[PDB]
């Protein structure tokens, strides 16, 4: 009888909720009450990268924190030198519908995917001075939402078919398949040690998965709508999620709870991208109101706004050394702030 | 110019890449874009065959005009998470089967999907081209089956005329943005041939009315 199983599952989730409640002795705000606030953060547009002709949907900084790859619906994947305004590369995609991009940590490969259900990996450091499609990973049923590199041979993707996957690049087969989500997975992030990863879906819940074993370690549910972004804290024991209800939430791995919520009454639109900064003191989040907000991670106050875009901000990133913050919006312009 | 030889060569390479990007964009800005939106295999494959994986693209030419048609009916995902990618499309094409009224009713689902697409917040200026089809088998069924099954509130003759017009008006009344949007209805069929000309005329009418709308007139 399925009713008995449903009742027993209800009992188990009630037990989990009670166990979580038992360990909540003090809130994050109470401990961080006595600390010096960061103050007012003023950032200036050092560079403006132009040349795209459509909506920019994703970007990813390089490991050297100097080169960056950007993807747009124009059908071009542009690799820029960020110190100057030069264009290192301009790759024409086979399918113009691209919604994600990635840059390999070694700096040799670049991956992109979208509505074609196929993740294309291009090799940049080749002979002949040309960029060609190294691999085309297929096997997904829904649109590809994100893709991240572990090394030069392994990749992790998530799709709208409520499924994530770990692929081996050399042989284009799904090495591991992660299932359990009841909604379209929209974002993922890798741990600094590349052993665990969290994924947010449209079922208003995030899940923490183990790469090697392939089973879901943990689940978290505190939101009210679709989750569009996720990112680990630099320490690696916490992460932050952004949803369509204009709220960011900081979950912690060890406490298995949510610690802090960032929201404000004047802001009501959704959130497209969330990323921390070096040392994890600041949290930058883009919004649908054409702006980007900086929150103090320890407290709940707001530090500043990065308002220099004329359309919805679709992606943003912070360098590995924290010197600059790049933002890309639905108008074809990339802006570097420092 | 406080630059080395290699930096100057890199600047030259970037300037050459800019020219190619601009030339590709200018060429890509001269094409007409159509988004095909059916409902439960309601004659979608019939019309794509008459014009000479998740998303399918069909490129063709007619009277010195390049048409690119996107079929996204095989996505089987949440529509609201990727529909905004199709903002700015020149026109939307809707296929409705007239023979499934006897066949949860399929016509009601088609009407609901048409209402959802037409009154969407992204396609507030794009025009919809209707392709009410399967007229022959519709007549064959209406000969021996009344239309009252779908529409209880209907008093009309049980013939092809006065019945297909009722369906056309019912589908057209679902529009709520008549101020900046128009619907072009056509009664095609499996053996019909002049569908491409109808699409061409609708597209050129849309182009003229958009050019005269940008300039401040109209």
């Amino acid at each position, epitope marked *: 009888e399925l009713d008995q199983l449903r009742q027993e599952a209800e009992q188990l989730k009630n037990q989990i909720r009670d166990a979580r409640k038992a360990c909540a002795d003090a809130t994050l705000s109470q401990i961080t009450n006595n600390i010096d606030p960061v103050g007012r953060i003023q950032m200036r547009t050092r560079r403006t990268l132009r040349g795209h002709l459509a909506k920019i949907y994703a970007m990813h900084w390089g490991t050297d924190s100097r080169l960056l790859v950007s993807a747009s619906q124009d059908g071009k994947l542009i690799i820029w030198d960020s110190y100057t305004t030069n264009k*290192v590369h301009a790759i024409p995609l086979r399918s113009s519908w691209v919604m994600t991009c990635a840059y390999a940590p070694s700096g040799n490969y670049v991956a992109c995917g979208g509505l074609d259900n196929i993740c294309s990996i291009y090799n940049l450091k080749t002979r*002949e001075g040309n960029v060609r499609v190294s691999r085309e990973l297929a096997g997904h049923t829904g649109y590809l939402s994100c893709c991240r590199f572990l090394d030069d041979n392994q990749i992790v993707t998530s799709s709208g078919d409520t499924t994530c996957a770990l692929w081996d690049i050399e042989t284009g087969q799904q090495t591991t398949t992660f299932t359990g989500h009841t909604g379209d997975v929209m974002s993922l992030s890798l741990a600094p040690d590349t052993r665990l990863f969290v994924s947010g879906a449209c079922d208003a819940s995030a899940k923490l998965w183990d790469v090697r074993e392939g089973m879901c370690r943990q689940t978290f549910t505190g939101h009210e709508s679709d989750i569009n972004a996720i990112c680990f804290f630099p320490n690696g024991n916490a992460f932050a999620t952004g949803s369509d209800d204009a709220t960011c939430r900081l979950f912690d791995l060890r406490a298995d709870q949510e610690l802090m919520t960032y929201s404000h009454d004047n802001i009501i639109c959704g959130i497209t991208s969330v990323s921390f900064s070096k040392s994890g003191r600041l949290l930058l989040a883009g919004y649908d109101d054409f702006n980007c907000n900086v929150w103090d991670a320890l407290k709940a106050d707001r530090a500043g706004v990065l308002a220099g875009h004329d359309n919805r901000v679709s992606c943003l990133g912070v360098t590995d050394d924290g010197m600059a913050v790049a933002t890309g919006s639905w108008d074809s312009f990339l802006k570097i702030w420092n | 110019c406080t630059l*080395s030889a290699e930096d100057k060569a*890199a600047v030259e390479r970037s300037k050459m890449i800019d020219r190619n990007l601009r030339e590709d964009g200018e060429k890509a800005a001269r094409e007409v874009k159509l988004l095909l939106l059916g409902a439960g295999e309601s004659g979608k494959s019939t019309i794509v065959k008459q014009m000479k994986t998740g998303i399918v693209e069909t490129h063709f030419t007619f009277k010195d005009l390049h048409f690119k048609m996107f079929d996204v009916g095989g996505q089987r995902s949440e529509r609201k998470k990727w529909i905004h990618c199709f903002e700015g499309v020149t026109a939307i094409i809707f296929c409705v089967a007239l023979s499934d009224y006897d066949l949860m009713n399929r016509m009601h689902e088609s009407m609901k999907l048409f209402d959802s697409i037409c009154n969407n917040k992204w396609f507030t200026d794009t025009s919809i081209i209707l392709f009410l089809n399967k007229k022959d088998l519709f007549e064959e069924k209406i000969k021996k089956s009344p239309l009252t099954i779908c529409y209880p509130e209907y008093a009309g003759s049980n013939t092809y005329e006065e019945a297909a017009a009722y369906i056309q008006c019912q589908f057209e009344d679902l529009n709520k943005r008549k101020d900046t949007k128009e619907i072009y209805t056509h009664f095609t069929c499996a053996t019909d041939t002049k569908n491409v000309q109808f699409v061409f005329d609708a597209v050129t009418d849309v182009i003229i009315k958009n050019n005269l709308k940008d300039c401040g007139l109209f």
Partner: single-chain antibody
Amino acid sequence: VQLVESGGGLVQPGGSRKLSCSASGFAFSSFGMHWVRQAPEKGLEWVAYISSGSGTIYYADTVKGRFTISRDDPKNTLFLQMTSLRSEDTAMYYCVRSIYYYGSSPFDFWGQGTTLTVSSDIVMTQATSSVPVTPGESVSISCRSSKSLLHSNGNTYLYWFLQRPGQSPQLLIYRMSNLASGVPDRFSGSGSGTAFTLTISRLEAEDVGVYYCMQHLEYPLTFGAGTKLEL
């Protein structure tokens, strides 16, 4: 990836000639090209350079005015037109490729060369001429400039080429302390702004040849005297 050169031969003084360089196996339309000549016994010497798209063309002062460079992209060919040949123009000519962007490796591939026989610049100096050494030891080669090769952006433009007896020059280290692809890690290079050194840890039987140090800070490009290695 291969380059084949045609032309050369015996030319009477005061005449004219044309040299062709055909590239097959790579994207010839996105690579800048160089013509470099070498005397029968002396060191290498730069001749001319043409950018991608023929936007910029640079000539050496020795043959400035009476030489012409050109390229054809659909046929993937490079042409050199030499006019009013003198007795000093006899040389082996090489057709080198070089692509310029961030992190690129200019002068990575060299042509085969064609022989021709006629009937205010930075001075790069290699004092050493020949070093006799046995295989298995570590060898250091010193190249001294006459100006600060270090630039305001932090890059040091110093290229090291190895030419084996009977073979075209091969790139080893393109910029200062930047090993090229396809060569063993046992080669290394360092410098101190004006004087630079090349170090080989475990010398083998394939390291016999001539080493050249070249500067790319500004045109005209200047080579150095040969530093032969003998067993």
